[PDB]
Structure formats: C-alpha cells, structure tokens
C-alpha cells in the first residue's frame, strides 16, 4: 500500500510482526541487552499501529530499511558497544543497509547457553511472550543469517516443549531430551540458511535459482515445468529477501507461497494433504520438509530431448538459462536419489559440453557422448561415500573422526587448529547421519551435509583468510566444493610449525571434563601433532596414538597430576623420538 510498515503489519499480525521485528534488531545489532531490543520494538509495533490507524502520520511513508535503519542508529553507543556499525549511521538510505548487513558475525564471542530445567521453567510460567522473545533473541543473535520465518516456528515449538515439560514433576527428564533434539535440528537450519544466503551473496541470484529448481524438481515430480518456474521465483524471492535482512517481507512472502501452494496442490505433489490442514507457520514448514512425490511413470527417455535430439544447439541458444534450467528440471525429476549437489554439477556440465559443441562443427557428434561424459560426475560421488563409510563402520565415530583430522590437516595445514577440529568434527558426525542409511538416500544425506559443513569452513576461513588452498576451493564454484576438496593432495610445501611443549602439555582437568569436552582437547593435539610432522606414516601416528591413550587411562587411573607431569614429557619425548 501506501505505508509499507501498515500492509506488513495487516498481512502478519501483531504478534508475527513483534517477534520478526525482535529477529531483525537481534540479528543485524547482535551484542545490544535483549530489553533494549524489546524497547524499540515495542516502539515501532506501536508506530505501525499508529499507520494502520491514520495512513498519514508523519513517516508512516518510508521505506522499512529507512524506519528500522532510524531507529537503529538511535541506539547511541552503537559506536561505543556494537562498534565501528556506528560509522554506517552516517549514510543514507540504500548504503546504510548494506553496510549494517556487512557487519553481521557468524562466530560472535557470545557464551554458549547451557539449559537449566527448572530457572528456565519458571521463566516460562511469569511471562511466556517475554521467554518466546528471548528464545527469538538468543538464536538469532548467535546465528545472524537465520531464516525469520523458520526461527519463529522453532520458538512455538520450544514455548509448547515448556508447555508440557513444565507441569511436570521432574522437569530436567522431559525438558532436557526434548530441547537438545531441537537444538540439533536448530543448527541445520542455520547452515542451511547460511549456505542459501552464502550463495546468493558471492555467486548470484543464478545459483539459488538453480539450487531451488533442483530441490522443487525432485520433490514435485508431478509438478510441469511452469509451475515449477513459478515456484522457484516466488521461493527465492523469499530467500533473497531473508537474506538482505527483509524479513517482515521475506514472512508475508513465505506465507503467500505456502497458501499458494496448498491451494494448487492437485498440481504440485499428492503428498502436501497432511501439510495444508495445518496452521500458517507449521504449514510453512511440513511444505519445506515434504516427502518426494512418486515418479511420474512412463517419463521419457533423457536422451531424447538432451543429447539425441538434433537441434539440441539451437535450443541452447536460443534461451540458455531456460534450456539449462529444463536440463535441471527433467534430470533432477527422474534422479530422486541423487543430491541436489550433484545434479547441480550435472547440469553444470551440461552447460559446459554444449558451449564446447555447440561451437564446433558436427555439434551432435560432440553432444551425443554427453550422457557417458556425465557417468564419471555421479560415479566419483558413490565411490567417495562408499570409501569413507566402510572407513566409518571399521573405526566408529571417534576413530573416523580421528582419521579425518589426519586427512585434512595434511591438506590444508595452514587453517586454524579449532577451526581444522570442528570441521573434522562434524565430517565424522557425518558417518552416524548417513552411513547407516538406506542406499537411496546414502547419497543425498552426505552430499548435502558435507556441502553445509565445508560451507561452515568457507565462512569461517573468508574472515582470516590463512591457506590460499582452501580459498580457491570456495571461490571457485559452490557446487564444485565437495569434488574440489576431496582431489586436494597433501601440501609439499608446508613448512612444519615447531616442538611446543605447551600445546601438548595435558593438565589434569582432562581426567574430569564434559566427554564431548575430552573429546575436543585430545583433538586439537592430535592436530597439532600432524602440523609439526606433516611428514608422517599412517603407522607412526598409530603409534602415537595408542601411546596417548596409555598416558590418558594411566595418569587418570591413578591419583594426581603429579603423574600427569611426571610422564607427560615422557610420552612427548617418546613422541618425538620419532615422529
């Protein structure tokens, strides 16, 4: 309309328009007190309120980026706290966005939060929008590229974890299980999110588009191209509004799709029913996590229309992104099995084959072999998850964890041990998420982990860029990254780091920690190990390694640190005595 903050806030809902406000003042000014954040937003709600009441009201006008850009400058000390996102107040009303929106931090210092069942319960009992805000205020603050829309599902989903868990006697038994499964499914979205908005940040609205046509193909199967195409351009819209930091339009836009396609269901998939019945933030998110519709049966060939047809080069030329996006579509329809990566890559090569031929004379000659050519991009994949996941089932998640901190640290020996530790981490936990899987499903789940975790090392290594390696792995291409790190050979021209009794001194404290806590320390030596012998063998560090456990199960077995000083210096000269 008119005012854009009165049609938002008609459209969303007082309650909707609270908390997405309460996303996006989190989200963009991340170290701000949550009672200062809920004093502004409580101010606009009562501006946008004003709006709806008399379209006229002096500012009721401006854009959402000028009304929430002004009261975020407001904030004085944004210079003082928040820091140098001061400067950008300066601006004016396209640059000052931009500017707020570069200064989002993806590993903010910010403490972790440990659960506590009962202080958190009563929490609940006093106000519960207040503890829904500050669910809202805690995720978002942690995780500054969250999907508005899908955060505020997550906290209606916590607010009823408490409806429940609270009236009950022992509150830790009900509350604990139930939050941790959510704080895991909490971090996926995240990462999925970040790698959307990844994406459109650093290799075009193309490659979200083509991501989303891939996705919606292999879900909606039924679904023609055309209404595909709509969807993928509604979908991201959205995502490139929840990426920009629009997120009052990034949730009235979710929300039209998801009306939009319960209501033309007859032609997108016989397995949205379930779904649609549901109320608006749930429906959203059964849409996003449906099951794949059957196969259309009696589909054609793919070499029909791709490779054996004749005028395969005239087609291309005439529309490219639509030849390729039809590419897309019919083999990622017919390919349920396959990751949306590496039909990605497919088409990718597809793109690729058909500029080489369509260029040369006797392009159908060119362009026939093309199907074979594509074998070895689906083939590498199967043989990597095959190879990795008899390793997973011979050494468990430890021990595979373990091995694959062995493997990256020889490769990309440069990037920062915790951050070596986490992705090595989460690329074992790849094992127990997919490994165990039917064989269909085998090659989405990893391919589409491991393309969220290398995700997290790309965002994680562009803040201090230290190995050239790994920069050239995520600038090249998004979907090339898996296939792109996997070929990395061990560094010959790594110049060791040096023997530091510090980094591998253990202290007692080791004998007493989390688990998840030992796990980590014992870790990051083994990491440090491998940069200050790049050179080892496979044998030697089983050497070491078994040698650790000894002075780990001895020194704890017995009474004190005294052993743990004694002996360590031993082992470290032990170690050194060959490796």
């Given at each position: 309309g008119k005012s854009e903050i009165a049609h938002r806030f008609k459209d969303l809902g007082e309650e909707h328009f609270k908390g997405l406000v309460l996303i996006a003042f989190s989200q963009y000014?991340?170290?701000?007190?949550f009672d200062e954040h809920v004093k502004l937003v409580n101010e606009l709600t009562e501006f946008a309120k004003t709006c709806v009441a008399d379209?006229?009201?002096?500012?009721?006008?401006?854009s959402l980026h000028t009304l929430f850009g002004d009261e975020l400058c407001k904030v004085a000390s944004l210079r003082e706290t928040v820091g140098d996102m001061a400067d950008c107040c300066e601006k004016q009303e396209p640059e000052r966005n931009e500017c707020f929106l570069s200064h989002k931090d993806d590993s903010p210092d910010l403490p972790k939060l440990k659960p506590d069942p009962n202080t958190l319960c009563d929490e609940f009992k006093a106000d519960e929008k207040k503890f829904w805000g500050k669910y809202l205020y805690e995720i978002a603050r942690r995780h500054p590229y969250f999907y508005a829309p899908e955060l505020l599902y997550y906290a209606n989903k916590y607010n009823g974890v408490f409806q429940e868990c609270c009236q009950?006697?022992?509150?830790g038994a009900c509350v604990l299980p139930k939050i941790e499964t959510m704080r895991e499914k909490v971090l996926v979205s995240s990462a999925r999110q970040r790698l959307r908005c990844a994406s459109i940040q650093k290799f075009g609205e193309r490659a979200l588009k083509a991501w989303s046509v891939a996705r919606l193909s292999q879900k909606f199967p039924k679904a023609e191209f055309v209404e595909v195409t709509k969807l993928v351009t509604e979908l991201t819209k959205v995502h490139k509004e929840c990426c920009h930091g629009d997120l009052l339009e990034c949730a009235d836009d979710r929300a039209d799709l998801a009306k939009y396609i319960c209501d033309n269901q007859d032609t997108i998939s016989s397995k949205l029913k379930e779904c649609c019945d549901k109320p608006l933030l749930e429906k959203s998110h059964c849409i996003a996590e449906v099951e794949k519709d059957?196969?259309?049966?009696?589909?054609?060939?793919?070499?029909?229309?791709?490779?054996?047809?004749?005028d395969v080069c005239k087609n291309y030329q005439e529309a490219k992104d639509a030849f390729i996006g039809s590419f897309l579509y019919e083999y990622s329809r017919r390919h349920p099995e396959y990751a949306v990566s590496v039909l990605l890559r497919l088409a990718k090569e597809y793109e690729a084959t058909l500029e080489e031929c369509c260029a040369k004379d006797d392009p159908h000659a060119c362009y026939s072999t093309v199907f074979d050519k594509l074998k070895h991009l689906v083939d590498e994949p199967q043989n990597l998850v095959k190879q990795n996941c008899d390793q997973f089932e011979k050494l468990g998640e430890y021990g595979f964890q373990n091995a694959l901190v062995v493997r990256y640290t020889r490769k990309v020996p440069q990037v920062s041990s915790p951050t070596l530790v986490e992705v090595s981490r989460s690329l074992g936990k790849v094992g127990t998420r997919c490994?165990?899987?039917?064989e269909s499903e085998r090659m989405p789940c990893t391919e589409d982990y491991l393309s969220l975790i290398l995700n997290r090392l790309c965002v994680l290594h562009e803040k201090t860029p230290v190995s050239e390696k790994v920069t050239k792995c995520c600038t090249e291409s998004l979907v090339n990254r898996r296939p792109c790190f996997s070929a990395l050979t061990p560094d010959e021209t790594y110049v060791p780091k040096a023997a530091d009794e510090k980094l591998f001194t253990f202290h007692a404290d080791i004998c007493t920690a989390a688990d998840t806590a030992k796990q980590i320390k014992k870790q990051t030596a083994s990491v440090e190990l491998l940069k200050h012998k790049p050179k080892a063998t496979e044998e030697q560090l089983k050497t070491v390694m078994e040698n650790f456990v000894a002075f780990v199960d001895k020194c704890c077995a017995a009474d004190d640190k005294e052993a743990c000083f004694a002996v360590e210096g031993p082992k470290l000269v032990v170690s050194t005595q060959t490796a």
């Open positions: 000014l991340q170290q701000c007190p379209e006229s009201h002096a500012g009721c006008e401006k009950a006697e022992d509150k059957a196969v259309p049966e009696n589909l054609p060939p793919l070499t029909a229309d791709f490779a054996e047809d004749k490994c165990t899987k039917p």
